[PDB]
Design a protein around this ligand. Structure first.
Ligand SMILES: NC[C@@H](O)c1ccc(O)cc1
Ligand code: VO4
Length: 424
């Protein structure tokens, strides 16, 4: 299994649909290594819940929480953590407004080596219960024989890329994790790291982050051959007055690079209503009427959530993925799993006559390139060759479908649990 790409367990589907699926408890289990220390980067945290996901024997090992909370929210987080002597926090600077620290990553230091986990789930019960979420598991990275001279680097430059990502936080607690990574052999890594970090980037620095980083990797590491682009996400930023402002111009341009139809997959009201969760799934799909009414054009790009291949049609997506399938959808030129949703905040927007990339948020993903495996393309695994976790080709919204919008009421039809949705 070259990909090490997994979905989270979904409770309440047939056990067959959970066979190759992982819950956080499985990720933190002793079968994965003898835990010594860990860092949990994320957006939302339930500390009590989180600590319980660790095996009892490991529950007292040091844990660093890397978050972006401020003021009263920071207060609350610290409050959640206080009861736990072994937990420290690192507040990631968010110097630009409307930025979030959105990256989901685990750094797991064991007696036997180091593991890196890049995934899409918040550290709260509901994100791991009945949602479709994605996980990439690094291999167990051995410690470098403390008597040998080696970089421990991979052909994909993952090790240096991860260190640069951590370096940008400028945070004392992360330097220690940077030192740990220095000491390990990450050479077996076959994926590319794609990060976002807050900033306004000029010249050479453009290629380091966001969609320009992706564009750069696709230039150097794919090659060419009406192959569509597919984008799949749970949050939608303000994209501009029309497609030419950002979506089809700079964003899609990065995405189509190699060496054009755009399918966007976003849950409809109907997908949410009949989900395992019902309407409360919409709490994790925060598309506001405010934003949506500014850009009604975007919605003709939208396709339904359907995941029969993985049995998760009813498990609302909090995973985010982007990919480049062939015209018949039987193959792909690459696959990206990331925390980045469909927003300029996450991906970057060009400022000052296209000479500046402005990014608002921390985001992190892994890119699977056939070349890193010595292939030209991946065959799509038809029934959850790359494991595409949702159905192809994507299915267009019906005429009566609407995109889920979180902050309006739905009272005409009850959801899966006989409830309505009246936000307020
Ligand atoms: N339910 C919390 C809400 O703020 C939220 C919504 C979507 C996310 O990805 C993360 C958090
Ligand atoms: O955690 V958010 O898409």
């Amino acid at each position: 299994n070259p990909f090490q790409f997994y979905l989270t367990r979904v409770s309440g589907v047939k056990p067959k649909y959970n066979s190759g699926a992982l819950h956080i408890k499985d990720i933190l289990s002793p079968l994965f290594g003898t835990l010594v220390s860990s860092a949990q980067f994320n957006y939302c945290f339930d500390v009590d819940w989180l600590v319980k996901q660790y095996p009892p024997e490991f529950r007292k090992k040091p844990i660093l929480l890397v978050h972006g909370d401020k003021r009263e929210a920071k207060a609350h987080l610290h409050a959640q953590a206080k009861p736990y002597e072994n937990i420290s926090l690192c507040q990631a600077k968010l110097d630009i407004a409307f930025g979030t620290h959105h990256t989901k990553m685990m750094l797991l230091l064991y007696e036997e080596g180091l593991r890196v986990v890049i995934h899409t789930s918040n550290l709260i019960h509901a994100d791991w219960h009945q949602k479709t979420q994605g996980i990439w598991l690094s291999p167990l990275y051995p410690r470098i024989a403390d008597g040998t001279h080696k970089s421990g680097e991979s052909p994909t430059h993952f090790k240096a890329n991860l260190i640069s990502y951590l370096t940008a936080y400028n945070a004392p607690s992360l330097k220690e994790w940077i030192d740990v990574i220095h000491k390990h052999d990450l050479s077996e890594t076959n994926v590319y790291l794609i990060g976002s970090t807050p900033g306004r980037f000029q010249g050479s620095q453009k290629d380091n982050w966001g969609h320009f980083r992706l564009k750069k990797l696709l230039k150097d590491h794919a090659s060419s051959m009406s192959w569509p682009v597919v984008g799949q996400f749970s949050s939608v930023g303000s994209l501009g007055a029309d497609e030419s402002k950002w979506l089809c111009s700079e964003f899609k341009e990065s995405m189509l690079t190699l060496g054009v139809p755009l399918y966007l997959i976003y849950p409809s009201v109907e997908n949410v209503r009949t989900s395992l969760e019902g309407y409360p799934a919409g709490g994790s799909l925060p598309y506001s009427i405010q934003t949506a009414e500014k850009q009604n054009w975007l919605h003709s790009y939208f396709h339904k959530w359907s995941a029969e291949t993985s049995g998760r049609s009813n498990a609302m997506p909090h995973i985010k993925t982007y990919m480049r399938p062939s015209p018949d959808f039987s193959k792909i030129a690459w696959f990206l799993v990331t925390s980045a949703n469909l927003s300029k905040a996450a991906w970057g927007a060009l400022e000052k006559n296209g000479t500046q990339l402005m990014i608002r948020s921390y985001e992190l993903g892994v890119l699977f390139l056939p070349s890193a495996l010595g292939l030209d393309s991946f065959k799509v695994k038809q029934k959850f060759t790359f494991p595409v976790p949702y159905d192809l080709p994507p299915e267009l919204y019906g005429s009566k479908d609407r995109p889920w919008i979180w902050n309006i009421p739905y009272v005409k039809a009850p959801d899966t649990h006989g409830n309505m949705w009246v936000p307020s």
